[PDB]
């Protein structure tokens, strides 16, 4: 996260760290959506142009974390993966369209003050909240700058951007399964997700019921926090029918 700040304790209890077993390192962010299911970006697991293709046994899920590098004894919980599910129409060839994956845990994780699931949006909450200018919140342990790494989980609040502005900021083809967020050059404020924040959640707090909803997944961006560029996020609601299908069939 660039130009963010340290998270408060328990501020993002759905935040998940995807952790590579060997070498031991941060692979991506992710989010807890139930006691057995974790949501992330497909490119965290599968990206052939960079020779990335992780299997279940390659990774661990670390939940309840605050410190990036510490083993947070008595606080974090570490889970093994039963199965990975990548969207069947994930477009890694072109533009990361449908950049979404689910991971089923081998065993249910116990909820605590530090571990708690985020809601997924319904059609109405999505329609109400996913509007230009409305701010969401992104969290992660990724880079502090485009080109270092944080001691603890970082957080930044960013406004959703009008679709034409998103489109006009890039030569890449944008789809309805993506949205973009961030400040414009003339807005003064800044902030962005970055490398390592991949797969983590873009959340919004509903003013109707005071619950946090995951509207986006950190997907892609041209560099980080560049003037005139924006962060792109997987549109969770647009892909919710797939999420429900996977959970209904394999849950």
């Amino acid at each position: 996260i660039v130009e963010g700040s340290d998270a408060e304790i328990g501020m993002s209890p759905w935040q998940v760290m995807l952790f590579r077993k060997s070498p031991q390192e941060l692979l991506c962010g992710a989010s807890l959506i139930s006691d057995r299911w974790v949501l992330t970006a497909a490119h965290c697991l599968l990206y052939p142009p960079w020779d990335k293709n992780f299997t279940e046994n390659d990774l661990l899920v670390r939940i309840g974390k605050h410190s990036r590098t510490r083993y947070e004894r008595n606080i974090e919980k570490i889970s093994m993966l039963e199965k990975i599910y990548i969207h069947p129409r994930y477009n890694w060839r072109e533009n990361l369209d449908r950049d979404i994956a689910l991971m089923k845990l081998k065993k249910p994780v116990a909820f605590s003050d530090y571990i708690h699931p985020v809601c997924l949006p319904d059609r109405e909450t999505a329609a109400s909240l996913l509007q230009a200018g409305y701010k969401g919140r992104v969290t992660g342990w990724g880079n502090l700058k485009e080109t270092g790494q944080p001691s603890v989980l970082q957080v930044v609040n960013l406004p959703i951007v009008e679709r034409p502005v998103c489109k006009d900021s890039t030569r890449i083809r944008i789809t309805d399964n993506m949205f973009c967020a961030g400040y414009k050059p003339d807005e003064g404020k800044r902030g962005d997700a970055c490398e390592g924040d991949s797969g983590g959640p873009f959340v919004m707090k509903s003013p109707f019921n005071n619950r946090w909803y995951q509207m986006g997944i950190v997907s892609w961006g041209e560099g980080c926090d560049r003037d005139g560029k924006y962060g792109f996020y997987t549109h969770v609601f647009r892909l919710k029918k797939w999420i429900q299908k996977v959970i209904d069939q394999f849950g």
Partner: peptide, 28 residues
């Protein structure tokens, strides 16, 4: 499930975090 999106250290105990108000203020 039924309790999703309500944080034990915040919503559950009616405490606000330091910047959630910024989100609320954007929701016009």
């Amino acid at each position: 499930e039924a309790d999703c999106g309500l944080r034990p250290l915040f919503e559950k105990k009616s405490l606000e975090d330091k910047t959630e108000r910024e989100l609320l203020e954007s929701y016009i």
